[PDB]
Amino acid sequence: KIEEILSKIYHIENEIARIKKLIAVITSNITEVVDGNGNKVNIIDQVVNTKPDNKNQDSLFLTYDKQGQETTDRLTIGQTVQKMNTDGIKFFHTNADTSKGDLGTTNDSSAGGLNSTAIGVNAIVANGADSSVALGHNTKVNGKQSIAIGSGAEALGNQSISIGTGNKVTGDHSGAIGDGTIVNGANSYSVGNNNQVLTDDTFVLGNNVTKTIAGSVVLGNGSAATTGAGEAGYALSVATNADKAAITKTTSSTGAVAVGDASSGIYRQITGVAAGSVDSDAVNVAQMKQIEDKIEEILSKIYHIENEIARIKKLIK
Amino acid sequence: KIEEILSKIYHIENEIARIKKLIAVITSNITEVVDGNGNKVNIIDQVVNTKPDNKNQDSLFLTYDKQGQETTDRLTIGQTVQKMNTDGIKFFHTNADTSKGDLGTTNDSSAGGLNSTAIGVNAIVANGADSSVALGHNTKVNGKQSIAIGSGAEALGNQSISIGTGNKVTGDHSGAIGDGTIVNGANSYSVGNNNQVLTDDTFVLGNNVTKTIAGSVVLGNGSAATTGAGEAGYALSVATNADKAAITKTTSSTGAVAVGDASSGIYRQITGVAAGSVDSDAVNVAQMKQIEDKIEEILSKIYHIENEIARIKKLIK
Amino acid sequence: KIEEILSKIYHIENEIARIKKLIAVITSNITEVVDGNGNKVNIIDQVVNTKPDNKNQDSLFLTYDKQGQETTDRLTIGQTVQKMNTDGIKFFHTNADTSKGDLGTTNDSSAGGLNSTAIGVNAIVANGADSSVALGHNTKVNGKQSIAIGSGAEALGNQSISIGTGNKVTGDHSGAIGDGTIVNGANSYSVGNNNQVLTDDTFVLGNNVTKTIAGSVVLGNGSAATTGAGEAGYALSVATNADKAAITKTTSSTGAVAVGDASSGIYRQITGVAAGSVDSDAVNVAQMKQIEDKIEEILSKIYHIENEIARIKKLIK
């Protein structure tokens, strides 16, 4: 039947028009979608940058340059993400060499401690160094609640602080601010350069200090504490018993305050010193001068007495 | 008409071949696109990792492990992004517990101040603490232009600095480096452990220091400043009027330098001290020895005078 | 031939059914893919957030708020990435103003040195300042292996350390902790506020200190070191030759320890001082009292001698 054939052909013609219609809309249907605001978003434009422009501050592909405070627009979302990943995010940038790390294949930081933070090239917090902080190239922290900041700073004791270039703090509850200093003493602190602090409860504000005593305080370039407890003070042997005990009562109890190093010819005046009042207060030159002046007054009475006696001796004869 | 039917069939056959052609290219057309370099990019491969490989340093899906300096390759771009987001980017890693924060549901840092930076687990800069820095687990900064670094460091005054474990600095323009120290004084600084600094313009380089006076400086473990301005120096009552005023001229103006604590039997020698020159310079043992030696020379003239007088008295009779 | 026409029509009907089948599966085929775990992933859901929910901690679109420790769920992957990029990742947040930077169009940090790390708004490490660290608003570091932390801290010398508000350290191997301090001296350190340290190997633990001598140590608010090497100690002119040389042997070698400033009426007692033993040890009040007491004993013998002599003179007549 012709009419049966014609009807099949009309139907097919209708199916074909409908097919072409479907085909038409597929694309726009697959790539164009509505986000949760009701904005139509094109999936392709979210993944591939349709118009790169380093100056377009609204680009979803934008990166913040690690130096110079400008931006760079990337080609795909993955590129953007990996640039962030290696060159930094805004306000957090590390400019790195191509070295190998001490622990693994990268030169990443390594935050090994629970609640630890590690920042910078080869900045390492050890496993177990909990609540610790490393910030800087080659920093290393092995202690709990410890801090290393700087180039090669190491904070290796518990509650250790190491700020500056290449200080190494092994003492617990200890620290060093400066460069090239080592602190092995516990409860000991150094401010300055090239110090070595082996003793406990020791403080150094100085450079090139290497001789200390526990409990000591060393002040200034090249000073040295070499004395501690039990140094008998200088006393006049012609002194009374009560006066010798008052001196003895002030006998040293612990490491000295050192302001120089007589060994090596290093001596500092102490200036701006108020007259002492009580037994263990320092004495100033004014207080010594009153004594000197009295010595002179005594000497002058003696000279006169000697004069009198000489005359008396002659008068007798 | 047969020929009319045949023609419709040929046309349809042509439309069908053309349809299949269109269908063929759709895919490659939808997913394969050209970026701004003219590189063909496959959208799917930008979003889903076609070949995960922890060692493939060019992977767009790569993450930098928070410890150990190795990498991990992720399955999708969103996974990569969220790993960066929680485990860190290269050179910026915090290894966190699963705690709740003090402010909100996460244990994130919180940079509350304008131009502030907050880093680490529960590291908090308060609203209004502008230009401030917190770096470390449980750090808290409430002051403007303030710095807390370490485990539980708090910098609560304006221009306050707190570096180490659990120091708390409330004073303005003040700071503490060490562990367990509190500084409430304004314009006051402590280096050391378990100090308490309540006074202003006070400096401590020491541990276990808790007694201070405004303007004082306390040096060493257990030292204590308990005296300030207006301490009348020790003076010989047999001294002249000019000599008493020279002493009085050097009377203390402010808190002492304390190197010990006579109360508790703590005393330190001061060593390396150069001979004083002017009135408010400290005196050393060498300068006291010259006086002692003169006392002996005086005593020996007196002994001889007494001898003479005794003979004179007998000679008279 | 009818039968030839019918056969072409049956074939076309079969092609049409097959086409519609292909069309059906395209979508699901293009967008639904298998990742490297064998999980089926929908490409669209990786790029566009199908259900935003600020509380959904598994969202691939989640951001960590820069303050308050809560999260925000974003609409597309690019939004997420750029929020991370500008507002921070978890544990690394800077809350920034809308300023211009000193170097470029943004207010980003700038890590100019190899292996340097720069963090915070307008935190700048210069080109060539290698292995250096800047952390804080307006920090600037120009030296190698240098550290600036705080608001406007500058570390401009090599191995320079500057922590606090607006300190400026130009000296090499030098540093300042505090606020408003300048250190131009090399190998010199200041703890405190508004100090100016022009000299080398100089240490200040104090505020408002501006007069120093190389090698000096200045302790406390307003103290001033104005003397160095070669100060001849106070000596009794009535002293022996050996005693004058012992004093001369302790003559100052370098900058003083200053605890006050006699110029401006500033004087501090030094308290807790143990009796000195050797020549360059400080002397305390106890050691001066033994001398004073002996002066009195001498004066009393002299008074008696004078008495005797007066009687002798009368007895003779």
**Chain C interface includes A88 (CB < 8 A):** yes
Q: Which letter does DSSP use for residue A277 in this model?
A: -
Write out the two tokens for B108: 């994130």
CB B281 to CB C46 under 8 A? no
Q: Measured between alpha carbons, how far is A130 from A147 in angstroms, rounded to an integer?
A: 11
* Kind plus residue range of the DSSP H or E element containing A147: strand A147-149
**Chain B interface includes A247 (CB < 8 A):** no
The four Cα atoms A189, A194, A196, A202 give a dihedral, to 10 degrees, of -30
Q: Which letter does DSSP use for residue A282 in this model?
A: B
Q: Which of A7, A11, A40, A69 to mutate to test the interface with C (most CBs of C within 10 A)?
A: A69
Cβ density class C245-259: b for 16+ within 10 Å, e for less = ebbebbbbbbbbbbb
Backbone φ, ψ for residue A252 (5° rounding): -50, 140
* Residues 6 or more apart in contact with residue C29 via CB below 8 angstroms: B27
**Chain A interface includes B52 (CB < 8 A):** no
**Chain B interface includes A191 (CB < 8 A):** yes
Contact residues, chain A, for B305 at CB < 8 Å: 302, 305-306, 309
Give C43 to chain A, closest Cα distance, Å: 9
Q: Measured between alpha carbons, how far is A142 from A155 in angstroms, rounded to an integer?
A: 6
**Chain A interface includes B203 (CB < 8 A):** no
**Chain B interface includes C114 (CB < 8 A):** no
Q: Measured between alpha carbons, how far is A267 from A261 in angstroms, rounded to an integer?
A: 6
Contact residues, chain B, for C291 at CB < 8 Å: 288, 291-292, 295
Backbone φ, ψ for residue A215 (5° rounding): 80, -5
**Chain B interface includes A33 (CB < 8 A):** no
Backbone φ, ψ for residue B227 (5° rounding): -135, 150
For residue B100, what is the nearest residue in chain C, using CA coordinates? C69
Give A289 to chain C, closest Cα distance, Å: 9
Which residue reads 């929680």 in tokens?
Answer: B86
Write out the two tokens for A106: 């990268």
3-state secondary structure of A246: helix
Q: Which of B271, B307, B315 to mutate to test the interface with A (most CBs of A within 10 A)?
A: B271
For residue A38, what are the CA distances in angstroms to A25, A35, A71, B82, B171? 20, 5, 30, 25, 53
Q: Measured between alpha carbons, how far is C211 from B298 in angstroms, rounded to an integer?
A: 43
Q: Measured between alpha carbons, how far is A9 from B119 in angstroms, rounded to an integer?
A: 73
Beta strand C133-135 with C147-149: parallel, antiparallel or unpaired? parallel
CA C24 and chain centroid, separation: 65
CB contact at 8 A, C139 and C161: no
Q: Which of A147, C90, A198, A35 is nearest to B82 (CA)?
A: C90
Write out the two tokens for A143: 């202690």
Contact residues, chain B, for C88 at CB < 8 Å: 109, 111
Contact residues, chain B, for C313 at CB < 8 Å: none
Q: Which of C139, C141, C138 is nearest to C155 (CA)?
A: C141
In DSSP terms, which residues pair with C118 in a beta bridge?
A93, C134
Q: Measured between alpha carbons, how far is A179 from A190 in angstroms, rounded to an integer?
A: 10
CB C177 to CB B175 under 8 A? yes
CB contact at 8 A, C191 and B189: yes
Which residue reads 């408010």 in tokens?
Answer: B280
For residue A207, what are the CA distances in angstroms to A37, A165, A177, C145? 64, 14, 11, 18
Rg (CA), chain A: 41
Contact residues, chain A, for C132 at CB < 8 Å: 151
Q: Which letter does DSSP use for residue A262 in this model?
A: G
CB A147 to CB B137 under 8 A? no
This entry's atomic model was obtained through X-ray
**Chain B interface includes C6 (CB < 8 A):** no
**Chain B interface includes C88 (CB < 8 A):** yes
Q: Which of B237, C287, C236 is nearest to A299 (CA)?
A: C236
Q: What is the 3-state secondary structure (H, E, C) of chain C?
A: CHHHHHHHHHHHHHHHHHHHHHHHHHHHHHHEEECCCCCEEEHHHHHECCCCCCCCCCCCCEEECCCCCCEEECCEHHHHHHHHHHHCECCEEEECCCCCCCCCCCCCCEECCCCEEEECCCCEECCCCCCCEEECCCCEECCCCCEEECCCCEECCCCCEEEEECCEECCCCCEEEEECCEECCCCCEEECCCCEECCCCCEEECCCCCCCCCCCEEECCCCCCCCCCCCCCCCCCCCCHHHHHHHHHCCCCCCCEECCEHHHCECECEECECCCCCCCCECEHHHHHHHHHHHHHHHHHHHHHHHHHHHHHHHHC
Helices (H) and strands (E) in chain A, counts: 5, 22
CB contact at 8 A, C85 and A64: yes
CA C253 and chain centroid, separation: 32
Residues in chain A: 317
Q: Which of C115, C113, C111, C105 is nearest to C143 (CA)?
A: C113
Q: What are all long-range contacts of A207-214, with beta carbons under 8 Å and residues at least 24 apart?
A: A207/A178, A207/C187, A207/C201, A211/A261, A212/A185, A212/A255, A213/A254, A213/A255, A213/A256, A214/A185, A214/A254, A214/A255
Q: Which of B266, C152, C149 is nearest to C160 (CA)?
A: C149
Contact residues, chain B, for A107 at CB < 8 Å: 69
Q: In chain A, positions 216-245, which contact chain C (CB-CB < 8 Å)? A: 219-222, 227, 231-236, 238-240, 243-244
Q: Which of C59, C218, C268, C294 to mutate to test the interface with B (most CBs of B within 10 A)?
A: C268
Give C304 to chain B, closest Cα distance, Å: 10
CB B108 to CB C69 under 8 A? yes
Write out the two tokens for A310: 């000489």
3-state secondary structure of A101: coil
CA A181 and chain centroid, separation: 13
Backbone φ, ψ for residue B242 (5° rounding): -60, -40
CB B281 to CB A270 under 8 A? yes
Q: Measured between alpha carbons, how far is B290 from C250 in angstroms, rounded to an integer?
A: 13
* Residues 6 or more apart in contact with residue C24 via CB below 8 angstroms: none
Rg (CA), chain B: 41
Give the one of C9, C120, C280 whose C-beta lies nearest to B273's C-beta. C280
